[PDB]
Scaffold this active site. Sequence first.
Site, PDB file in Angstrom:
ATOM      1  N   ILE A 134      43.382  17.932 -37.518  1.00 51.15           N
ATOM      2  CA  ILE A 134      44.172  17.192 -36.524  1.00 51.15           C
ATOM      3  C   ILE A 134      43.905  15.689 -36.602  1.00 51.15           C
ATOM      4  N   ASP A 194      48.506  43.366 -37.863  1.00 53.01           N
ATOM      5  CA  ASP A 194      47.718  44.548 -38.169  1.00 53.01           C
ATOM      6  C   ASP A 194      47.266  45.279 -36.902  1.00 53.01           C
ATOM      7  N   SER A 217      50.113  35.646 -32.726  1.00 52.69           N
ATOM      8  CA  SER A 217      49.097  34.740 -32.220  1.00 52.69           C
ATOM      9  C   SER A 217      49.795  33.513 -31.639  1.00 52.69           C
ATOM     10  N   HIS A 265      47.555  23.269 -45.431  1.00 54.51           N
ATOM     11  CA  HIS A 265      47.887  23.127 -44.014  1.00 54.51           C
ATOM     12  C   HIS A 265      47.597  21.681 -43.640  1.00 54.51           C
ATOM     13  N   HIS A 325      56.257   8.882 -49.086  1.00 52.54           N
ATOM     14  CA  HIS A 325      57.015   8.963 -50.330  1.00 52.54           C
ATOM     15  C   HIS A 325      56.101   9.372 -51.487  1.00 52.54           C
ATOM     16  N   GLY A 330      47.747  30.898 -39.726  1.00 54.47           N
ATOM     17  CA  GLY A 330      47.153  29.589 -40.000  1.00 54.47           C
ATOM     18  C   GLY A 330      46.157  29.566 -41.159  1.00 54.47           C
ATOM     19  N   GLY A 339      39.100  17.157 -38.676  1.00 53.88           N
ATOM     20  CA  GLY A 339      39.865  16.504 -37.613  1.00 53.88           C
ATOM     21  C   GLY A 339      39.392  15.068 -37.464  1.00 53.88           C
TER      22      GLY A 339
HETATM   23  C1  LIG Z   1      52.866   3.474 -46.401  1.00 45.89           C
HETATM   24  C2  LIG Z   1      52.035   3.107 -45.200  1.00 45.89           C
HETATM   25  O1  LIG Z   1      52.295   2.130 -44.521  1.00 45.89           O
HETATM   26  S1  LIG Z   1      50.729   4.053 -44.785  1.00 45.89           S
HETATM   27  C3  LIG Z   1      49.308   3.640 -45.774  1.00 45.89           C
HETATM   28  C4  LIG Z   1      49.173   2.130 -45.874  1.00 45.89           C
HETATM   29  N1  LIG Z   1      47.872   1.742 -46.461  1.00 45.89           N
HETATM   30  C5  LIG Z   1      46.645   1.798 -45.923  1.00 45.89           C
HETATM   31  O2  LIG Z   1      46.422   2.254 -44.810  1.00 45.89           O
HETATM   32  C6  LIG Z   1      45.473   1.262 -46.740  1.00 45.89           C
HETATM   33  C7  LIG Z   1      44.567   0.451 -45.798  1.00 45.89           C
HETATM   34  N2  LIG Z   1      43.346   0.016 -46.496  1.00 45.89           N
HETATM   35  C8  LIG Z   1      42.096   0.306 -46.099  1.00 45.89           C
HETATM   36  O3  LIG Z   1      41.851   0.980 -45.119  1.00 45.89           O
HETATM   37  C9  LIG Z   1      40.840  -0.142 -46.810  1.00 45.89           C
HETATM   38  O4  LIG Z   1      40.508   0.642 -47.980  1.00 45.89           O
HETATM   39  C10 LIG Z   1      40.445  -1.627 -46.759  1.00 45.89           C
HETATM   40  C11 LIG Z   1      41.529  -2.703 -46.859  1.00 45.89           C
HETATM   41  C12 LIG Z   1      39.849  -1.716 -45.366  1.00 45.89           C
HETATM   42  C13 LIG Z   1      39.318  -1.938 -47.750  1.00 45.89           C
HETATM   43  O5  LIG Z   1      39.797  -1.974 -49.094  1.00 45.89           O
HETATM   44  P1  LIG Z   1      38.784  -2.250 -50.323  1.00 45.89           P
HETATM   45  O6  LIG Z   1      38.021  -3.509 -49.984  1.00 45.89           O
HETATM   46  O7  LIG Z   1      39.542  -2.159 -51.625  1.00 45.89           O
HETATM   47  O8  LIG Z   1      37.745  -1.046 -50.109  1.00 45.89           O
HETATM   48  P2  LIG Z   1      37.160  -0.062 -51.238  1.00 45.89           P
HETATM   49  O9  LIG Z   1      38.094   1.103 -51.435  1.00 45.89           O
HETATM   50  O10 LIG Z   1      36.678  -0.845 -52.442  1.00 45.89           O
HETATM   51  O11 LIG Z   1      35.870   0.499 -50.493  1.00 45.89           O
HETATM   52  C14 LIG Z   1      34.701  -0.243 -50.122  1.00 45.89           C
HETATM   53  C15 LIG Z   1      34.361   0.790 -49.076  1.00 45.89           C
HETATM   54  O12 LIG Z   1      34.312   0.476 -47.692  1.00 45.89           O
HETATM   55  C16 LIG Z   1      34.569   1.800 -47.180  1.00 45.89           C
HETATM   56  N3  LIG Z   1      35.953   1.866 -46.634  1.00 45.89           N
HETATM   57  C17 LIG Z   1      37.091   1.537 -47.281  1.00 45.89           C
HETATM   58  N4  LIG Z   1      38.172   1.712 -46.483  1.00 45.89           N
HETATM   59  C18 LIG Z   1      37.727   2.162 -45.302  1.00 45.89           C
HETATM   60  C19 LIG Z   1      38.339   2.556 -44.014  1.00 45.89           C
HETATM   61  N5  LIG Z   1      39.683   2.494 -43.836  1.00 45.89           N
HETATM   62  N6  LIG Z   1      37.512   2.978 -43.027  1.00 45.89           N
HETATM   63  C20 LIG Z   1      36.176   3.040 -43.184  1.00 45.89           C
HETATM   64  N7  LIG Z   1      35.553   2.701 -44.328  1.00 45.89           N
HETATM   65  C21 LIG Z   1      36.261   2.263 -45.402  1.00 45.89           C
HETATM   66  C22 LIG Z   1      34.422   2.771 -48.373  1.00 45.89           C
HETATM   67  O13 LIG Z   1      33.951   4.080 -48.042  1.00 45.89           O
HETATM   68  C23 LIG Z   1      33.541   2.025 -49.374  1.00 45.89           C
HETATM   69  O14 LIG Z   1      32.207   2.003 -48.843  1.00 45.89           O
HETATM   70  P3  LIG Z   1      30.851   2.232 -49.718  1.00 45.89           P
HETATM   71  O15 LIG Z   1      30.383   0.811 -49.908  1.00 45.89           O
HETATM   72  O16 LIG Z   1      29.955   3.066 -48.827  1.00 45.89           O
HETATM   73  O17 LIG Z   1      31.272   2.925 -50.996  1.00 45.89           O
HETATM   74  C1  LIG Z   2      47.477  23.540 -34.581  1.00 41.42           C
HETATM   75  C2  LIG Z   2      46.855  22.569 -35.552  1.00 41.42           C
HETATM   76  O1  LIG Z   2      46.963  22.688 -36.768  1.00 41.42           O
HETATM   77  S1  LIG Z   2      45.993  21.285 -34.946  1.00 41.42           S
HETATM   78  C3  LIG Z   2      44.275  21.730 -34.953  1.00 41.42           C
HETATM   79  C4  LIG Z   2      43.914  22.177 -36.358  1.00 41.42           C
HETATM   80  N1  LIG Z   2      42.470  22.393 -36.502  1.00 41.42           N
HETATM   81  C5  LIG Z   2      41.559  21.477 -36.813  1.00 41.42           C
HETATM   82  O2  LIG Z   2      41.817  20.282 -36.952  1.00 41.42           O
HETATM   83  C6  LIG Z   2      40.123  21.943 -36.982  1.00 41.42           C
HETATM   84  C7  LIG Z   2      39.528  21.146 -38.152  1.00 41.42           C
HETATM   85  N2  LIG Z   2      38.114  21.520 -38.256  1.00 41.42           N
HETATM   86  C8  LIG Z   2      37.101  20.654 -38.216  1.00 41.42           C
HETATM   87  O3  LIG Z   2      37.234  19.469 -38.075  1.00 41.42           O
HETATM   88  C9  LIG Z   2      35.669  21.033 -38.340  1.00 41.42           C
HETATM   89  O4  LIG Z   2      34.923  21.057 -37.127  1.00 41.42           O
HETATM   90  C10 LIG Z   2      35.034  21.195 -39.707  1.00 41.42           C
HETATM   91  C11 LIG Z   2      35.752  22.148 -40.662  1.00 41.42           C
HETATM   92  C12 LIG Z   2      34.999  19.771 -40.229  1.00 41.42           C
HETATM   93  C13 LIG Z   2      33.591  21.658 -39.516  1.00 41.42           C
HETATM   94  O5  LIG Z   2      33.559  22.993 -38.997  1.00 41.42           O
HETATM   95  P1  LIG Z   2      32.118  23.680 -38.703  1.00 41.42           P
HETATM   96  O6  LIG Z   2      31.406  23.613 -40.022  1.00 41.42           O
HETATM   97  O7  LIG Z   2      32.335  24.994 -38.018  1.00 41.42           O
HETATM   98  O8  LIG Z   2      31.495  22.586 -37.719  1.00 41.42           O
HETATM   99  P2  LIG Z   2      30.666  22.840 -36.373  1.00 41.42           P
HETATM  100  O9  LIG Z   2      31.576  22.822 -35.173  1.00 41.42           O
HETATM  101  O10 LIG Z   2      29.728  24.011 -36.566  1.00 41.42           O
HETATM  102  O11 LIG Z   2      29.791  21.510 -36.336  1.00 41.42           O
HETATM  103  C14 LIG Z   2      28.864  21.154 -37.370  1.00 41.42           C
HETATM  104  C15 LIG Z   2      28.750  19.684 -37.088  1.00 41.42           C
HETATM  105  O12 LIG Z   2      29.482  18.783 -37.847  1.00 41.42           O
HETATM  106  C16 LIG Z   2      30.049  17.914 -36.862  1.00 41.42           C
HETATM  107  N3  LIG Z   2      31.526  17.967 -36.970  1.00 41.42           N
HETATM  108  C17 LIG Z   2      32.304  19.061 -36.841  1.00 41.42           C
HETATM  109  N4  LIG Z   2      33.612  18.735 -37.004  1.00 41.42           N
HETATM  110  C18 LIG Z   2      33.653  17.413 -37.252  1.00 41.42           C
HETATM  111  C19 LIG Z   2      34.705  16.415 -37.519  1.00 41.42           C
HETATM  112  N5  LIG Z   2      35.994  16.805 -37.560  1.00 41.42           N
HETATM  113  N6  LIG Z   2      34.334  15.132 -37.717  1.00 41.42           N
HETATM  114  C20 LIG Z   2      33.046  14.739 -37.692  1.00 41.42           C
HETATM  115  N7  LIG Z   2      32.028  15.587 -37.463  1.00 41.42           N
HETATM  116  C21 LIG Z   2      32.275  16.912 -37.238  1.00 41.42           C
HETATM  117  C22 LIG Z   2      29.573  18.389 -35.489  1.00 41.42           C
HETATM  118  O13 LIG Z   2      29.400  17.305 -34.579  1.00 41.42           O
HETATM  119  C23 LIG Z   2      28.261  19.090 -35.815  1.00 41.42           C
HETATM  120  O14 LIG Z   2      27.260  18.093 -36.012  1.00 41.42           O
HETATM  121  P3  LIG Z   2      25.733  18.265 -35.488  1.00 41.42           P
HETATM  122  O15 LIG Z   2      25.080  18.803 -36.738  1.00 41.42           O
HETATM  123  O16 LIG Z   2      25.317  16.860 -35.122  1.00 41.42           O
HETATM  124  O17 LIG Z   2      25.779  19.225 -34.321  1.00 41.42           O
END
Ligand SMILES: CC(=O)SCCNC(=O)CCNC(=O)[C@@H](O)C(C)(C)COP(=O)(O)OP(=O)(O)OC[C@@H]1O[C@@H](n2cnc3c(N)ncnc32)[C@H](O)[C@@H]1OP(=O)(O)O
Ligand SMILES: CC(=O)SCCNC(=O)CCNC(=O)[C@H](O)C(C)(C)COP(=O)(O)OP(=O)(O)OC[C@H]1O[C@@H](n2cnc3c(N)ncnc32)[C@H](O)[C@@H]1OP(=O)(O)O
Lengths: 193, 194, 194
Positions: free
Chosen positions: C154, C35, C12, C133, C124, C55, C172
């Site tokens: 993705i 197959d 594939s 995957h 880390h 995959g 994704g």
């Molecule tokens: C090693 C590296 O450099 S890579 C990784 C480095 N670290 C990171 O990326 C961490 C970055 N931090 C974040 O994204 C966030 O969690 C922050 C700073 C924006 C918020 O932190 P906190 O205030 O502790 O958020 P907490 O986990 O309590 O969640 C409150 C939430 O807001 C939402 N929320 C938290 N983070 C995110 C985000 N990144 N995107 C969208 N929504 C978020 C949660 O779903 C929850 O919502 P709810 O009220 O519906 O339950």
């Molecule tokens: C080579 C590589 O490894 S790279 C590429 C690897 N492959 C991927 O990343 C594929 C990952 N798969 C997905 O993200 C998905 O679409 C899944 C598993 C989250 C959902 O799959 P399905 O259940 O078949 O979703 P389907 O395409 O039927 O859509 C159902 C819906 O959920 C939503 N939806 C689907 N995928 C996503 C997503 N990633 N984020 C947010 N919403 C999504 C669609 O918009 C649709 O919503 P609607 O009810 O408003 O129409």
Amino acid sequence: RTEKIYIYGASGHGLVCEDVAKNMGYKECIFLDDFKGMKFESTLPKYDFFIAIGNNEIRKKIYQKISENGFKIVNLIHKSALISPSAIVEENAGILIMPYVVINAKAKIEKGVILNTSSVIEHECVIGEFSHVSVGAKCAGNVKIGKNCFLGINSCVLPNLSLADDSILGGGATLVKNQDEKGVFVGVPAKRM
Amino acid sequence: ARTEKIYIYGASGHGLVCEDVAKNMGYKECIFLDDFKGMKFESTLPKYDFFIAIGNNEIRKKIYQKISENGFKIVNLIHKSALISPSAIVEENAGILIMPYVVINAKAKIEKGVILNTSSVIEHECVIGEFSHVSVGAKCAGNVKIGKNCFLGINSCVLPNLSLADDSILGGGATLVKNQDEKGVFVGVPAKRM
Amino acid sequence: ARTEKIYIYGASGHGLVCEDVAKNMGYKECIFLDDFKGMKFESTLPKYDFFIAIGNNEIRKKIYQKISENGFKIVNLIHKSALISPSAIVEENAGILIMPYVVINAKAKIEKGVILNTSSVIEHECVIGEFSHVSVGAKCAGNVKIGKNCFLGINSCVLPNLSLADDSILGGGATLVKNQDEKGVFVGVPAKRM
Ligand SMILES: CC(=O)SCCNC(=O)CCNC(=O)[C@@H](O)C(C)(C)COP(=O)(O)OP(=O)(O)OC[C@@H]1O[C@@H](n2cnc3c(N)ncnc32)[C@H](O)[C@@H]1OP(=O)(O)O
Ligand SMILES: CC(=O)SCCNC(=O)CCNC(=O)[C@H](O)C(C)(C)COP(=O)(O)OP(=O)(O)OC[C@H]1O[C@@H](n2cnc3c(N)ncnc32)[C@H](O)[C@@H]1OP(=O)(O)O
Ligand SMILES: CC(=O)SCCNC(=O)CCNC(=O)[C@@H](O)C(C)(C)COP(=O)(O)OP(=O)(O)OC[C@@H]1O[C@@H](n2cnc3c(N)ncnc32)[C@H](O)[C@@H]1OP(=O)(O)O
């Protein structure tokens, strides 16, 4: 390759292209920009040429103009780009391939495409002419990107999907459905604006 | 120029990755310092190169200040795989971490104490303010201004020509599409004030 | 006695990319199996290294079991551009795929049959469970525990210190911001159960 190269575009995009050109071993870049620098003339000496214009429509227009006026428009491909031996990259077609881009098996890159820093083109994709795949944008396997498309920073397209000619996928957007008509798609999942 | 040994302040996960970068650069021996978990920092230590391996921006700055005020050189740890444009500016001996596969393009400026984590991208003409943390896979488009002490979470991104106020957090996976001159926590696609 | 040939199970697109990795590693000949008449796996195939380029996690596991139980070696295919910390653990001869420009940082553990796709990052101290995957550009922050048979889509990401239950899917583009100890499909920024 010639020793000198014309870089059309006196901007940050031009500078980045100049860096790639230097990476490939060009000794000297001669910038031209009718708005922002030294104006082009059709009687300039013939060296390798590149169009460093980010806007897809303008890049195509200038590509046509320059290609008509006799110049060879090379590809600029950073040494760190990884390109499958079975991938197809149109030769001398003004394609930019930035650092750490990966192009996997049987993918096809058409003329005037930009693949920007750290973008990924998975196996069997087709990237249509004068498209711009932005920084960190990723196309999964068997994705067909239409002509003149723009995929925003850190956007992605799920496998087996098509994006219609002249479309924009916004920064950070995740395209999860086929789109057979031109549009602007934003969000996770990406939806029409 | 570099010393045979390096003191890495931060005996933690972040410390481990910094050690790998230091070894990549050619340091023979890494000596961890940590005031709670191992060997203590003392102003009387030999003047080996130093690095502050602390992820928290505020604490890293506090420790950076303490070490620099004691006459120690805080070097940059830059992985050999990082690609840095000849016209980019990276502040010399300024405790900057540049992880593997990071790209910094033309005329971008990286200020003291910044972390550019694995596979981040800083596009042309960006300014990344002192003691900011650009996380793994986070990407700044062209002409982006990141304030002092900012934190851009994993896989976050900023669209071109935008500015983010000092002391802001861009959440994991967030996409900043508008200027933010008032500090805050911005989350989502598009990034909204929390 | 030079090692030159490898069977790649899965004719594939995934098969084609696995072939490119194998050839990058210096294999001269790749023999596809699947197959279909004329190319099926058989117990008495002449012994060469195998790889399972499937995959689908569940099918990959099934074929791994079958080939393994026939006394054959299932190698890891690891692109030379992958950066793997000296303190990371990647299970040896365990059918692991590591694609171009993956980074695996200090003390992370990669278990058998895992796929780490192009430009993914494992930070880390992560543990990536067997037959998971991690898709193209997907990134796990520090100390993340990915369950067995998980699929990270993705450009998805997982914030630090989080755990994802066995047999889960992160969509994704999804950003996982909380622990999930009950399996499901999690989509969006932030990732929510579907
Ligand atoms: C090693 C590296 O450099 S890579 C990784 C480095 N670290 C990171 O990326 C961490 C970055 N931090 C974040 O994204 C966030 O969690 C922050 C700073 C924006 C918020 O932190 P906190 O205030 O502790 O958020 P907490 O986990 O309590 O969640 C409150 C939430 O807001 C939402 N929320 C938290 N983070 C995110 C985000 N990144 N995107 C969208 N929504 C978020 C949660 O779903 C929850 O919502 P709810 O009220 O519906 O339950
Ligand atoms: C080579 C590589 O490894 S790279 C590429 C690897 N492959 C991927 O990343 C594929 C990952 N798969 C997905 O993200 C998905 O679409 C899944 C598993 C989250 C959902 O799959 P399905 O259940 O078949 O979703 P389907 O395409 O039927 O859509 C159902 C819906 O959920 C939503 N939806 C689907 N995928 C996503 C997503 N990633 N984020 C947010 N919403 C999504 C669609 O918009 C649709 O919503 P609607 O009810 O408003 O129409
Ligand atoms: C150098 C390189 O190659 S890398 C970087 C290259 N450049 C890019 O990635 C830029 C890509 N462009 C974009 O993402 C977008 O802003 C576009 C094209 C989708 C929309 O552009 P415009 O129509 O000018 O949008 P504008 O900024 O006026 O905002 C209208 C809005 O839609 C929303 N919006 C804009 N862009 C996005 C996005 N990427 N994701 C989600 N929502 C968005 C805004 O929040 C605002 O909503 P509001 O009505 O609530 O205020």
